[PDB]
Design a binder for this molecule. Structure first.
Ligand SMILES: C[C@@H]1C[C@@H]([C@H](O)CC2CC(=O)NC(=O)C2)C(=O)[C@@H](C)C1
Ligand SMILES: [K+]
Ligand SMILES: [K+]
Ligand SMILES: [K+]
Ligand SMILES: [Mg+2]
Ligand SMILES: [Mg+2]
Ligand SMILES: [Mg+2]
Ligand SMILES: [Mg+2]
Ligand SMILES: [Mg+2]
Ligand SMILES: [Mg+2]
Ligand SMILES: [Mg+2]
Ligand SMILES: [Mg+2]
Ligand SMILES: [Mg+2]
Ligand SMILES: [Mg+2]
Ligand SMILES: [Mg+2]
Ligand SMILES: [Mg+2]
Ligand SMILES: [Mg+2]
Ligand SMILES: [Mg+2]
Ligand SMILES: [Mg+2]
Ligand SMILES: [Mg+2]
Ligand SMILES: [Mg+2]
Ligand SMILES: [Mg+2]
Ligand SMILES: [Mg+2]
Ligand SMILES: [Mg+2]
Ligand SMILES: [Mg+2]
Ligand SMILES: [Mg+2]
Ligand SMILES: [Mg+2]
Ligand SMILES: [Mg+2]
Ligand SMILES: [Mg+2]
Ligand SMILES: [Mg+2]
Ligand SMILES: [Mg+2]
Ligand SMILES: [Mg+2]
Ligand SMILES: [Mg+2]
Ligand SMILES: [Mg+2]
Ligand SMILES: [Mg+2]
Ligand SMILES: [Mg+2]
Ligand SMILES: [Zn+2]
Lengths: 105, 217, 159, 52, 58
RNA sequence: UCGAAUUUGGGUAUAGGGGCGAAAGACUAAUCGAACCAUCUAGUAGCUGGUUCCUGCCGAAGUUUCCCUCAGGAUAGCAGAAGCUCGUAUCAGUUUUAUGAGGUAAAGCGAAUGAUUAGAGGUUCCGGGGUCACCUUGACCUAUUCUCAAACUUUAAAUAUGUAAGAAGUCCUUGUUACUUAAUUGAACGUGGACAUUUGAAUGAAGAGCUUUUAGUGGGCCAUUUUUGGUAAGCAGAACUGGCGAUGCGGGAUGAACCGAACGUAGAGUUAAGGUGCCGGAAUACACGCUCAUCAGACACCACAAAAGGUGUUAGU
RNA sequence: GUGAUUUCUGCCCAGUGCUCUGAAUGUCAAAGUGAAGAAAUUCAACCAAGCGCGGGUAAACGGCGGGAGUAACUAUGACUC
RNA sequence: GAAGACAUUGUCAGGUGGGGAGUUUGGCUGGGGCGGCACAUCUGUUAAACGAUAACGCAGAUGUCCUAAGGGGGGCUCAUGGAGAACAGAAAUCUCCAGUAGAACAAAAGGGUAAAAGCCCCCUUGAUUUUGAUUUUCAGUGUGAAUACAAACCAUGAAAGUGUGGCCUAUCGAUCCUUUAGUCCCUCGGAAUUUGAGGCUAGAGGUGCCAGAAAAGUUACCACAGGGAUAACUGGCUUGUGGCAGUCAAGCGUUCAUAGCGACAUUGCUUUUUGAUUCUUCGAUGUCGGCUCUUCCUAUCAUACCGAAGCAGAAUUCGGUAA
RNA sequence: GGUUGCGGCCAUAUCUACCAGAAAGCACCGUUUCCCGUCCGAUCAACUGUAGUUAAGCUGGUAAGAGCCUGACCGAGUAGUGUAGUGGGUGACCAUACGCGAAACUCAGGUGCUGCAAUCU
RNA sequence: AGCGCCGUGACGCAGUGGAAGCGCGCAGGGCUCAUAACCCUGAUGUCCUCGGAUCGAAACCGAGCGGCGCUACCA
RNA sequence: AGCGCCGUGACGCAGUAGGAAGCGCGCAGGGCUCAUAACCCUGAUGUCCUCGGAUCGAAACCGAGCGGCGCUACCA
RNA sequence: AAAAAUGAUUAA
């Protein structure tokens, strides 16, 4: 799929509260960042004797992911998250379609 | 090596024609449906004799072929080929299925039983009911006994009950003989390939003169 | 596996009628529905918005809500051992007035008219409908109508 | 059932073997091949050009 | 060992044992699903007509 | 086999996931693919078996959805109990009237889409093997003709199915509003007034509504009809209804389900289904015919019969 | 491991295993080192063995192919692909 | 005498470690296993004209694709045929006529659509924010999908109007944990500041056994609880397959359908084969054959008496009564 | 009654061939400076209503016309079907009783009706 | 019975939805007295059939044909 | 015993989904050679195993026979 | 010290 890098959409930033211009990027997760409480609990539980203490997932079925769009207002820098359907190929702001063109083979 | 006809005698299933969902059907055994002087005109063979079914069943194409051969061969041997026209009036459109099993000692190691029992096409049958014409013969009045006994011989090739009916219609037309005579004495009948065309009060007038010209005189 | 989607088994009842395809005539859109009107549900297959589910084809209900292009229809649906109130949001394409309720309203006006006349003259106007009564006596004259008919007929081949 | 599998690495050319029950799942890569036109080859490192 | 898959046998007899009952309509049904603009109006119309009735009766 | 890798006493050593094994998973005190004794320990069991007095009243389920769910649970239903608010109704496994909805049965194919038999007449700048604008395998068109469809259809039943048949109604004024209209227009809700005892079809109503809480069940099976797979099946799988299970009684000799009819303890009468030669209660009744079998026949479910044939005999065309 | 004597014990080290090097590099723990921070801490470099890369080894585990043409009767195929 | 701050020993860290330990090794299923997916779904049919409806029924499809293939508006009309135009021909572009869709609309199938939902062009982001109500599956739970409003902000158009993704019917995912966005808010409990951590609202990372454990085999050395809910022997139903009989009569039999045969067809019977089924038996009915011994059946090989023959005789062949 | 503007039902309105059309209306029609749009003033834009024509559109008629619409004790109470019997038949199936009931077929008619507003030999 | 695979130039075989390639074989010329070797040059394919989807299939789908195989266990 | 197959010159092989047969060896005759062999050309050689059927027409389709090939043939 | 195989039968 192909989504533009720029998009006009509603911004609920308490100063816009209206359709403003947004910059579009893809959401990236970020580092798991140990010292999170779940990570501390997990390290404490895995210490000592007893083997593996938690489930280890194996039965992978999905091959794609949902794409999340990170929308940034250009007036107040407020951000918003939009979700798209599953896709295999995702690209941002590239190569708008040409309608009446010969096949390149 | 084909199953006896009692396995497929009755119309237990819905019709199962060759279609885009079936498309893997063997060819029917019967290919010829008109025999004798099939190009003969209507007025040449005023007499019609029918082999009317008396049971609601289905007739295999093998039986249709066998009775076709028997009736045609007898009538051709006795009164020649040009003395009659035989039209068989049922087509094997229903497909029979067989769930084929192994038939040897040791079949139990691989037999699979009644699982996935949907059968594959096995043969073709024509579905007929009470009073449905199977065979029709048109000939002259003087050739009545030959075609009657030929249809009697064809009867033994079919399962169940069948009657022999002398028609009161002129040949293969839907008209009685006296009314067909009344129509040729007028200008209401024009010859065609083997059948005829009729003149009506309806339609374009000038068309009804270019056809049937000798009427309106 | 089995398939039980929203529009399954609707092949023939979401057809348009033969030689009746195309656009909808404006009398569909000029009909006025009030709350309390009794309407019949029949989906127009050419309008895929506000379309009722296949269950409600042929059901008759009461309008409870009126919106811009749609009405809210209340239908009683038998689920198990009781009827559940079901509320539908249907565009007016799939909706027509119940003609039976139109004759009921006309009959109410006619009943009022009969009672109004009877209050002045001709008391005991006897409003209620009655079922088809047995016929009374009559004298069937034969003069010019002499009875004449034969017996059953013999069997003939006709083949 | 179990499946014994013998396969050659598509890059290193080495034989790999593995075995698994016939009804468990294994991964299959998303192997794709692409046409390119051969420009210069200087320090190895073939320089290639796409359909564009 | 396969068992029976499905049947609606005896289900109507069970349903009719305690009868199939209509949902007992009331006067003044709930305004759930009615248009909010209509509901907002109707609150003020009811308030005004009760005010007029109480003012007249005293 | 019998002079040695011999046989054997006594002593001694090796102890249980340990020993010992010229190897058999052998042996380790009648115990060995992990001894024996005691304890944890009344170990756990969705599995088998059992589960102790009487009478009275009511009275099932084998189905829905979810579950490493398929011999089990939860959930809803079916059942009981406690009742509560009222006192003939906001009702109904029914009909009528009115009004919808449907695409099956049937039908149709010289109507669409597919399938399909045979000729006829025209179209070769549409290729016909043929000689200078032709009968002579084709393909196309036109008018015909034979036969078809679970996944074709113009048409289109029967049965089943929705709704309405008023007081929470109808009509007349004029009130509310921030909704609506160009508007003092509507929308919805109202004040006041009018409508009489047929308050707006029929029949019935055994009291009508309402609530809490909890049992068992969650293997089903049979019959008529519809119906799928299968050569078929006392086969496997669905639909509606009635049954059996849970149920005796009369009849079908016998039999879960068929027919009749459902059950407190008795008496009398009358019947059902089925019968009335004798077993066996009840006409070896009456009447008109048919049948003679050196393998007659003799009551539905049901305990089978076919294609085919006969100057047997009877009736008939 | 094989199993008296006799006579033999062919070919295959790609896989699995076993074994032997290098420092030319990849992976790379704890401790130690450096840097940013107020500090917890974060980042980076260095980084043993093993792994990885590369040799050896079958009386280690084991393994030990298809198709086609071709001779002056055919048939077969010494030969050839 | 050797050896020496090295070894050793202690603690932590990486590797190796079936030698040993613990555990697991899905379900449905005409028994199980192998196969398949009928395990979450969608179209048509089965399905019996409301709705619902099963099978390892039938014919298929889904785990995607799309900044346009979404939204609005404008203009035009498609498949196909006929007649024509240099190269150009059956298929290149151009023109006219006919053309109810016989085209196209991402992708199965069904439905829908002609001044359009198709094709081309001009703008655009409504594929947005806040929640509630509703429909389908349904317990009237969730999830997925969808319908109609409300309050905003917008797009498009002259405007009515339309637009909360794809013309409709499929295209997907809880708890815990991690992560991001939002409010710049609440808490770290002796009082503050700053890091850090924890909360509230809303997305993502995934459970396809799709209401969502983290999971390899073998056992003929085997064990237990059970099951005739379920296979393997007998019996029962069926009789495809096996075996036997009939009807017809093309043809064979020098001449001649039927002395004897008898194709193509077709009607049966039997239970001595093999299957199908799963009703009886799993707190056990001893499971092949042979040997021994009795009896029964007849569909008769021989023997008795017969009829027929392409029966001179002989020898045969067909048939009746007959076990 | 004709015509026009907007329509309602959406073929009794459609289709094929031919004929006719006072008056008005509609239409064809003439032109490109302007607004606007094209490969092309052909469509669309604008101007004139003048220069011309009913040739075409449009409206009506004609046709043993095609289609479509309505009806018939035409087929036919046929096909189908609900209920019932210890009905018939070996069975497939069939009849009867109490009910409902087609579609093809044949024949006969018909071929737009109409609302608001303006105008007219 | 159920399931899987293969079919390409004369032969053995590759093959990326944009009309097919390696090795021999074959053909032409040369060298040799001649053949082979050798040298210089060319050519050879409804991709098993018949339909379908796609603008376009050798590849995808449906059938039909011909070969190769696998399962065949507890009784 | 069943279920599939196949049979084409003197010898082998090709048909194909019906409109009468091709190729290669062998034979004979020619061309080359002193004469041969090899080579080349040409010709002959198949009543498609027999019989029967359906068809306008069968080596191709159907049945029988004959011969050969391949697969299958209690049971615990 | 590069490579270099073959040549049908009979006929003083
Ligand atoms: C596969 C990974 C983890 C998974 C999930 O946290 C796994 C389990 C872990 C656990 O122990 N208890 C749970 O309740 C969930 C999840 O959410 C996915 C999106 C991402
Ligand atoms: K089941
Ligand atoms: K249907
Ligand atoms: K184990
Ligand atoms: Mg610790
Ligand atoms: Mg540790
Ligand atoms: Mg069936
Ligand atoms: Mg939509
Ligand atoms: Mg001795
Ligand atoms: Mg052992
Ligand atoms: Mg012992
Ligand atoms: Mg009691
Ligand atoms: Mg009781
Ligand atoms: Mg039990
Ligand atoms: Mg149970
Ligand atoms: Mg019970
Ligand atoms: Mg009895
Ligand atoms: Mg009864
Ligand atoms: Mg007595
Ligand atoms: Mg040794
Ligand atoms: Mg060796
Ligand atoms: Mg470190
Ligand atoms: Mg081995
Ligand atoms: Mg272990
Ligand atoms: Mg299982
Ligand atoms: Mg599930
Ligand atoms: Mg239905
Ligand atoms: Mg968190
Ligand atoms: Mg049982
Ligand atoms: Mg048999
Ligand atoms: Mg059992
Ligand atoms: Mg027992
Ligand atoms: Mg047991
Ligand atoms: Mg015994
Ligand atoms: Mg006998
Ligand atoms: Mg020599
Ligand atoms: Zn902003």
């Amino acid at each position: 799929v192909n989504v533009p890098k720029t998009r006009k959409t509603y911004c609920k930033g308490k100063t816009c509260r209206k359709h403003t211009q947004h910059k579009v990027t893809q959401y990236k997760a970020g580092k798991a960042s140990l010292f999170a409480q779940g990570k501390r609990r997990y390290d404490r539980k895995q210490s000592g004797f007893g083997g593996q203490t938690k489930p280890v997932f194996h039965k992978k079925a999905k091959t794609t992911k949902k794409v999340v769009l990170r929308l940034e207002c250009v007036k107040c820098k407020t951000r918003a998250q939009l979700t798209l359907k599953r896709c295999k190929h995702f690209e941002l702001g590239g190569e708008k379609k040409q309608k009446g063109q010969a096949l390149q083979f | 090596a084909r199953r006896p006809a009692r396995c497929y005698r009755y119309q237990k299933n819905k019709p199962y024609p060759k279609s885009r969902y079936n498309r893997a059907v063997p060819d029917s055994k019967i290919r010829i449906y008109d025999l004798g002087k099939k190009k003969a005109t209507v007025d040449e063979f005023p007499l019609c004799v029918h082999l009317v079914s008396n049971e609601l069943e289905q007739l295999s194409s093998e039986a249709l072929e066998a009775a076709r051969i028997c009736a045609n061969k007898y009538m051709t041997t006795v009164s020649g080929r040009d003395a009659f026209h035989l039209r068989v009036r049922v087509h094997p459109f229903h497909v029979l299925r067989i769930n084929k099993m192994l038939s040897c000692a040791g079949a139990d190691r691989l037999q699979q039983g009644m699982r996935g029992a949907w059968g594959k096409p096995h043969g073709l049958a024509a579905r007929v009911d009470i009073g449905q014409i199977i065979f029709s013969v048109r000939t002259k009045d003087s050739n009545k006994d030959v075609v009657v006994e030929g249809l009697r011989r064809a009867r033994y090739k079919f399962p169940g009950q069948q009657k022999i009916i002398l028609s009161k219609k002129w040949g293969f037309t839907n008209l009685d003989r006296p009314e067909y005579l009344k129509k040729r004495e007028a200008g209401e009948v024009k010859d065609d390939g083997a059948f005829v065309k009729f003149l009506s009060k309806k339609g374009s007038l000038e068309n009804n003169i270019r056809e049937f010209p000798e009427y309106f005189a | 596996g089995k398939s039980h989607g929203y529009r399954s088994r609707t092949r023939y009842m979401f057809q348009r009628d033969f030689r009746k395809h195309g656009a909808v005539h404006l009398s569909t859109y000029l009909k006025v529905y009030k709350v309390g009107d009794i309407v019949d549900i029949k989906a127009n297959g050419s309008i895929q918005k506000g379309m009722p589910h296949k269950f409600y084809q042929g059901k008759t209900g009461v309008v409870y809500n009126v919106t811009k292009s749609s009405v809210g229809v209340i239908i009683n649906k038998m689920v198990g051992n009781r009827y559940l109130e079901k509320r539908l949001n249907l565009r007016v394409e799939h909706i027509k007035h119940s003609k039976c309720r139109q004759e009921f309203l006309e009959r109410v006006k006619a009943n009022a008219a009969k009672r109004a006349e009877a209050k002045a003259q001709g008391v005991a106007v006897q409003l209620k409908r009655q079922p088809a009564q047995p016929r009374e006596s009559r004298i069937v004259s034969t003069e010019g109508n002499v009875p004449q008919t034969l017996a059953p007929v013999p069997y003939e081949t006709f083949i | 059932a179990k499946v014994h599998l013998v396969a050659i690495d598509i890059f290193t050319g080495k034989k790999l073997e593995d075995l698994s029950p016939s009804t468990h799942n294994m991964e299959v890569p998303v192997v794709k091949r692409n046409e390119y036109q051969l420009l210069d080859i200087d320090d190895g490192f073939l320089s290639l050009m796409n359909m564009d | 060992a396969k068992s029976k898959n499905h049947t609606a046998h005896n289900q109507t007899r069970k349903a009719h044992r305690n009868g199939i009952k209509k949902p007992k309509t009331y006067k003044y049904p709930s305004l759930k699903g009615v248009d909010p603009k209509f509901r907002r109006n109707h609150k003020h119309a009811l308030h005004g007509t009760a005010k007029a009735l109480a003012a007249a009766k005293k």
